[PDB]
Each structure stands twice: as structure tokens, then as C-alpha cells.
Curated annotation (Swiss-Prot):
Activity is increased by Mn(2+) and Mg(2+). Optimum temperature is 50 degrees Celsius. It comes from Homo sapiens. This is Alpha-1,6-mannosylglycoprotein 6-beta-N-acetylglucosaminyltransferase A. Residues 51-56 are annotated as: Important for activity in FGF2 release. The lineage of its organism: Eukaryota, Metazoa, Chordata, Craniata, Vertebrata. Belongs to the glycosyltransferase 18 family. Pathway: Protein modification; protein glycosylation.
Length: 502
């Protein structure tokens, strides 16, 4: 019953051959196999990985079911979306290497069969698959609720997750209203502290034409109305493309869709990877940076959200994007990432001229390496418990309380102290007695069911405490009062984990 690290992919390869729909994912795993095996052994030398119970794990890929009508496997090789497939590939690989008993499903039959057999201890699924899970199992689906880890790339804010509160605000999201512990949502980037950061691994194969730029956007429509911007870059640089077509100027050198090996070799010799503004928060820019390319990161002033961007309407968040790649912007920055308004011609020109004159190294944040990802997911599996069975994680010792000023969210105030909001600690900040510990003195108080509390008015020393524990929210600014915010430290380059969380 104890987990043994796997260093051989033969069983994973047989598992991935059962469905055609896993083909793209199988090629990625085979290209990164050596780096994966190097990282599980390396992690095992740094950390006792013994004494872990082997878990029976459901991995249900809703996006690859017919019934979903997503047809994501059918566009994998022709410029279709791959970020979800990137993340699913790396999640499956990590579970496999860490020695767990994985049962993969891309169908209602396998979902039913695997659950039928019992002993499932852990469930990875997407929101489309979660609807299927509830429908296939019936009312006893809720018995398995605390085991769900829900891969939700853009994240779910608590106001969208609480079904009744969401209705009361007129949130029509088809993605929300699941009433989970919002830490059960697993995001693509660490942009939503209400959720967990799952991420993925940035592919790279290193052991450069200074003039060569490569445009981000493997679909022609993404290039709509970028002619002036591309012209600026073309004044200094060749402009290449990987596009599967009358938006793409005449001077653009289109290589077509490249297989990962060949795309990775084009990144190796490219000086500048160029963002057009779409798509949002994908892997491709981190691949460019891992290959020593600068990334030109379109800045959004004002920031993009459901308030002003059609793509975001219906998504279970009000999160504002400051750039095409806010993670690249804030967690990498210069010299690797240049965040520029495509409007300000000077800004764009100076960025290109500087990029030409820079000498930069390949860079990967630790959390996006094989070993980083294995450490993050191993800590989640061993320590993250919503089934009340284990000791408190993260541990109470990690709690740092900060007061958010009016118009500042808990996300922002934790971040401004190089901490991260830790929603599992809201429970320790929610009554008169507890606030004394954190030098807030409540002259009066009341309860409220609001995402903005616990709140404190320092003028009349009045405390509002949370009436509905499902509405605890790192997201959200009080326009008038201070918020009492739970923060935590993180391991350097590993924001998912507190220093005492391993
Ligand atoms: C897989 C998944 O659920 N990903 C996240 C999701 O992202 C959305 C999802 O869209 C799935 C497909 O949904 C419909 O079938 C279409 O909108 C597809 O787009 C294609 O066809 C459209 C017309 O039918 C066309 O408008 C469009 O240009 C495209 O060619 C979608 O593929 O996944 C895609 C791809 O990344 C994404 O763009 C969608 O936003 O959002 C969820 C909520 O944020 C999140 O939980 C989930 O991880
Ligand atoms: O010609 C190409 C261009 C991109 N990619 C891959 O497409 C993946 C997804 O990158 P992107 O940021 O475009 O995410 P998406 O929008 O596809 O989810 C990355 O791993 C790239 O390596 C590819 O295989 N061939």
C-alpha cells in the first residue's frame, strides 16, 4: 500500500495508447521523459518520499469526452488550444512518477466503471467533467466532493462559487455555483489565491539570430489589426510565424504549425517572442523565455476583465488582467519580459531596441520545472485535505495578518508584503476575541454574508464578521473600511507552498 517512485514510462505509454484522444499528450510526455525521470530521482534525493500511501486516483478529462462537444483532441495538431492538454499531460505524468494508482477516463463509461469499484481517494477533473460526474453518480456525488481537484485555468472567485450568493448578484456564469471549498480549484498560473496553483512544466531542450522575432498566435484571426505594431518590430527584425490568412503581412515568414521538437528549435534561435494581445495566460511565452527569448508582453491599460472584454463574460471571476501574461509581467519582468502598450509607439520601439542590445540567459521559474511541479503536486496530495481526516495545512504558524486599506483586496495587501493570501486562515480571523491577538479592537460588531468581511472601520472601531464561511474571499476591495486579511510566506519560486508546508 506504499507509493514507490516510477522511473520507467512503459506502463504510462500503454495507458495513454487506449484512446486516440491522448495522442498529442503522449508525444509531449515522450519528448520530456528524460527530464521527468531526472527530476523525480533528484526530488527523492532532496526529500524523504518514503512513507506515502499509494492513492487510487480518478483522472477524468471532461474536455476530451464527445458529450462535451469541445473537440480539443481534433484541433491539437492544427493550431487548436493546447494549454489544457499541456497541464493534463504534466498532471498525469506527475501522479505516475510519484507512484499513485492512476485510472484515466475520457468517457462516461470509464467514469462510472472506475467510481463503481470504490477505493477512489482523490479525483482530478475539469468543470465540464464535474457536471458529468454529478449526472453519472446522482445524489451521492456529494459524498466524493471533498476529494475533487478541479482544473480551472482562469480560476473561480468565491462570489461565483457560492450558488445562492452568485444568484443574488445576477452572476449568470455557466462555470460557477459548485459550492466547493474554492482551494479545490487548480489554476494555470498563481493569479487567484482563493484557489490552488497547479500550473504545468515549461518544455525546453538546451544543454541566436539577433534579428529574428517570432509572433505568438497560431491562428490567423489573432493577427487582426496588428499591422502597425508588427511594422514597428519589422523595422529592426525579421518577423516569423507558426500559423496553420489575409491578416498576416507579406514580410512574415510562416513556418506553419511545428511539432514540439521543431518549435523548440525555432525558439532556440529566436531573439524576441511577440505577443499580439491574445491568447491570455498561455504556456507559449514561458517556453520562449526558457529558450532565452525576450517576450514582448502587450500591456492592458485599463486592465481586461468581464467589465470590458467579451472573452471574460460568463467566467466565474472578476479578476483583472494587467497584460496578455500577468504572470510573465510580475513574476519574471525585465530583462526577459517587456510589458508595453501597443498604442505607445515609443515604448514599443525602445523595448525592441533594448531587447536587441540585451544578453539574457534561458530562465524558468522553479515552480514551472519538472522538479518544482513534482514537489508542488506531492505536497498537495500528501498535505491538502478537505475531508477533515488530516492536521491543519497550511499550519497556523504560517499566518501573517495584514489590514487591507479601503479599495485594496486581501490578494493585493498580502502580495505588497511579498506574502500570498491564504484563505484557510479566514476562520481564525472572524470574532471579537481573535482580533485582539492582531491588535484590532472591536468597540462593536455585527455579522454579514459578504465577500468583503471580516472588515474593520478604524474611525468608529466597528467590526463586521463573516456570517457564511463559504463567502470568505481573498478577492474584493472594501470601498470604505479596512479588510482583515490572512497572509502566508512562500518557498522562493514556489508560491503554492508556505516555508513550513513540505
Ligand atoms: C477546456 C476548458 O474548459 N478550459 C477552460 C475554459 O476555457 C474555455 C474552453 O472552451 C471550450 C470550447 O467551448 C466551446 O466549444 C467553444 O467556445 C470552443 O471555442 C472554439 O469554437 C468557438 C465557436 O464554437 C469559437 O468561438 C472559438 O474561437 C473556438 O475556435 C471552446 O474550445 O476552452 C477554450 C480553449 O482554451 C477557451 O477559449 C474557453 O474560454 O474556461 C473555463 C472557465 O474559465 C475554465 O474552467 C476551463 O479550464
Ligand atoms: O507551432 C506551434 C506553436 C505552438 N505550439 C505549442 O502550443 C502550446 C500552447 O501554447 P499557447 O500559449 O498558444 O496555448 P494555447 O493558446 O494553445 O492553449 C505550447 O506548448 C507550444 O509549444 C506548437 O506545438 N506548435
Amino acid at each position: 500500500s506504499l507509493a514507490e517512485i516510477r522511473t520507467d514510462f512503459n506502463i504510462l505509454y500503454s495507458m495513454m495508447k487506449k484512446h486516440e484522444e491522448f495522442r498529442w499528450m503522449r508525444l509531449r510526455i515522450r519528448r520530456m521523459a528524460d527530464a521527468w525521470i531526472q527530476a523525480i530521482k533528484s526530488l527523492a534525493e532532496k526529500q524523504n518520499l518514503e512513507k506515502r500511501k499509494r492513492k487510487k486516483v480518478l483522472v477524468h478529462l471532461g474536455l476530451l469526452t464527445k458529450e462535451s462537444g469541445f473537440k480539443i483532441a481534433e484541433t491539437a495538431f492544427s493550431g487548436g488550444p493546447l494549454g489544457e492538454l499541456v497541464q493534463w499531460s504534466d498532471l498525469i505524468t506527475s501522479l505516475y512518477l510519484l507512484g499513485h494508482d492512476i485510472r484515466i477516463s475520457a468517457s462516461l463509461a470509464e467514469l462510472k466503471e472506475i467510481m463503481g469499484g470504490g477505493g477512489v481517494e482523490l479525483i482530478y477533473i475539469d468543470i465540464v467533467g464535474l457536471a458529468q460526474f454529478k449526472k453519472t453518480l446522482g445524489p451521492s456525488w456529494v459524498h466524493y466532493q471533498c476529494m475533487l481537484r478541479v482544473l480551472d485555468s482562469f480560476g473561480t472567485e468565491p462570489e461565483f462559487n457560492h450558488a445562492n450568493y452568485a444568484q443574488s448578484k445576477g452572476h449568470k456564469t455557466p462555470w460557477g455555483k459548485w459550492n466547493l471549498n474554492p482551494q479545490q480549484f487548480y489554476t494555470m498560473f498563481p493569479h487567484t489565491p482563493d484557489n490552488s496553483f497547479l500550473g504545468f512544466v515549461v518544455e525546453q531542450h538546451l544543454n541566436k539570430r539577433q534579428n529574428q522575432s517570432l509572433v505568438y498566435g497560431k491562428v490567423d484571426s489573432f493577427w487582426k489589426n496588428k499591422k502597425i505594431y508588427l511594422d514597428i518590430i519589422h523595422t529592426y527584425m525579421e518577423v516569423h510565424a507558426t500559423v496553420y490568412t489575409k491578416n498576416i503581412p507579406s514580410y512574415v515568414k510562416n513556418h506553419g504549425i511545428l511539432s514540439g521538437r521543431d518549435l523548440q528549435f525555432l525558439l532556440r534561435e529566436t531573439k524576441l517572442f511577440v505577443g499580439l494581445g491574445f491568447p491570455y495566460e498561455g504556456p507559449a511565452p514561458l517556453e520562449a523565455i526558457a529558450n532565452g527569448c525576450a517576450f514582448l508582453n502587450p500591456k492592458f491599460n485599463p486592465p481586461k476583465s468581464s467589465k470590458n472584454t467579451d472573452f471574460f463574460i460568463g467566467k466565474p471571476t472578476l479578476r483583472e488582467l494587467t497584460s496578455q501574461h500577468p504572470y510573465a509581467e510580475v513574476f519574471i519582468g525585465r530583462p526577459h519580459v517587456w510589458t508595453v502598450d501597443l498604442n505607445n509607439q515609443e515604448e514599443v520601439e525602445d523595448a525592441v531596441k533594448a531587447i536587441l542590445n540585451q544578453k539574457i540567459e534561458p530562465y524558468m521559474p522553479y515552480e514551472f520545472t519538472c522538479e518544482g511541479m513534482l514537489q508542488r503536486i506531492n505536497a498537495f496530495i500528501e498535505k491538502q485535505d478537505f475531508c477533515h481526516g488530516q492536521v491543519m495545512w497550511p499550519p497556523l504558524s504560517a499566518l501573517q495578518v495584514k489590514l487591507a486599506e479601503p479599495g485594496q483586496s486581501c490578494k493585493q495587501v498580502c502580495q505588497e508584503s511579498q506574502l500570498i493570501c491564504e484563505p484557510s486562515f479566514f476562520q481564525h480571523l472572524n470574532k471579537d476575541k481573535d482580533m485582539l491577538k492582531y491588535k484590532v479592537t472591536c468597540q462593536s460588531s455585527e455579522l454579514a454574508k459578504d465577500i468583503l468581511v471580516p472588515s474593520f472601520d478604524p474611525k468608529n472601531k466597528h467590526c463586521v464578521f463573516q456570517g457564511d464561511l463559504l463567502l470568505f474571499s481573498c478577492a474584493g476591495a472594501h470601498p470604505r473600511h479596512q479588510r482583515v486579511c490572512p497572509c502566508r510566506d512562500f518557498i522562493k519560486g514556489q508560491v503554492a507552498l508556505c516555508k513550513d508546508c513540505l
